[PDB]
Amino acid sequence: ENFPIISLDKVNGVERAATMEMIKDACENWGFFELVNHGIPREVMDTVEKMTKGHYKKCMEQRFKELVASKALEGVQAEVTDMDWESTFFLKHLPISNISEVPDLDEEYREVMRDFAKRLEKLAEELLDLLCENLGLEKGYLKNAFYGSKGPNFGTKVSNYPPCPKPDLIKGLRAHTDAGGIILLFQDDKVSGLQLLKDGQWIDVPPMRHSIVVNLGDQLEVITNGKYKSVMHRVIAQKDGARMSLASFYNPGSDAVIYPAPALVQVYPKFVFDDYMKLYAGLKFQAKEPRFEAMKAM
Template sequence: MEKNIKFPVIDLAKLNGEERDQTMALIDDACQNWGFFELINHGIPYDLMDNIERMTKEHYKKSMEQKFKEMLRSKGIDTLDREVEDVDWESTFYVHHLPQSNLYDIPDMSDECRTAMKVFGKKLESLAEELLDLMCENLGLEKGYLKKVFRGTKGPTFATKVSNYPPCPKPELIKGLRAHTDAGGLILLFQDDKVSGLQLLKDGDWVDVPPLKHSIVINLGDQLEVITNGKYKSIMHRVLTQEEGNRMSVASFYNPGNDAEISPAPSLGEKESDYPSFVFDDYMKLYSGVKFQPKEPRFEAMKNPAAASDLTPVATVETF
């Protein structure tokens, strides 16, 4: 990995002062050249984030840790002696916010945690919509354009994947999460500030996403690449396992509604676009089987259904 690469960290509070133009330029550059950036001073209360971290880790110890160990045993990888390429060293559950919440259907979650997750979800939803409008401004799109596209006829979908990556005895043999691009729209990640592991692929090198306390990591999904006609990119990323420490990850996905019609914005296409037009749910049905494969064949398959036969499903993922 190149040592002189500086990961983009953006102070969102500077949008309200004399450095607004420079801050907007930093966001635009990160979207074009990284597909990732890290926000500080984003407006989400730090005490809320601290409570989410504490309760997430408590929930894992109480309700998930034993299930994770049983899963490892059931798959025969509790004692690693070979490289494993079809399983992730990851314990997860999903909180759905929009269009309907499942917070009160999740077993063994405390009422305190449910309340905190509900508030946290609303804060992240607002931040996601603010960022989409900032992207519109940078792209020369009318304000609200991206939110309108995402809305479809029934509103966007929004959910949080709560993950823990427990210590792994042989991290060289298995990934915490295999390399992939995200299918959806805008991803907002609250990650552990003590245990690292998240990396993105930048110019052929795997680059660490720095674990900063109280930051929110932003990355772009495939839908924003299509809508921006490739000006903004979704980027391959992965999570490495670690021998010590339990890494927490709370990733919230602000995605288009299932019936949202996705296509390149007309004002961003100087010529016929290489990107397809499709209904978001159709893309997700394809993605669910080929998440850990390159995105370009997925785009081609949405343009030309016959190309889908060249894709070999290798993974099943949650869709929301």
């Protein structure tokens, strides 16, 4: 019954019970919701957008000069059509902020991303408390569970990309659930180009200006014992939609022990988060002894 667009300002007013029930429905039946009025000004978001696209334009002009020169060595003229327009870089925020160390950024850009990261962290931890309330758990339970020793892993994937040549090329393309905790996507434009899978069929995430698309990953499903499931999805670059994405991942800390909350109890396993990501990466079957056991299980 339509995608959950949720006005987050309504959670400190008279329409709170409706808004929290809307979040509850989203968490249980969609695994995805779109936030508006979320305590991050348009001032801040447009500043992030303007400067990211500025940095992107520098990288593309630099890339073309290098392409023209490298192609010229082969006795070949580089065209603009030979461009790899894709550019992606990651920024660590927690536990240690890696914005200082990332190459080729303005200082004014670095400051705004430190500010932007601080604001999202509060939003993420606010949302986790709203989930804690809907689930019937104490405030900061999910923040606590995500902490481990050092603290939770938090970071932003900043990517700029062209549109797809034709949509039919993305026909038999593989989808996924996010392995992490909670994910917050900020984009330019209205159109995200993001689809999710509900009851066998693709639904587009509706376009909204100045919105944050939130979704739940595999860890929240383990902690909620299957109640809040991580849903299948895929992001596709639309012809006249978004061409810039800022996916911010708030996952548990490396050494954090993840398990279903005792109260919320067919049964999801107990494990350390780094082991889950080591299974995901495929490092846990480099020795032969693991492999024989896994083949015995299958």
